[PDB]
């Protein structure tokens, strides 16, 4: 499971098992990676060229 071969988790207390899907998430925060890069550079140029 730690090698990302079989996807699933067990139950030690009751001896049960659970269902675990492969994808853990979607692509959302990735779109913010481009916005944070422009606001940490261009914005610095906005104040310097104006002053």
């Amino acid at each position: 499971i730690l090698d990302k071969i079989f996807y699933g988790v067990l139950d030690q207390g009751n001896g049960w098992l659970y269902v675990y899907e492969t994808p853990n998430q979607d692509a959302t925060y990735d779109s913010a990676l481009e916005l944070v890069g422009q606001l940490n550079k261009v914005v610095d140029q906005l104040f310097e060229k104006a002053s």
């Binding site: 914005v43 906005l46 060229k49």
Partner: peptide, 13 residues
């Protein structure tokens, strides 16, 4: 509108 926020400072300089 974040680019329009940047676009107007392009003029302001």
């Amino acid at each position: 509108a974040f680019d329009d926020l940047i676009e107007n400072k392009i003029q302001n300089k």
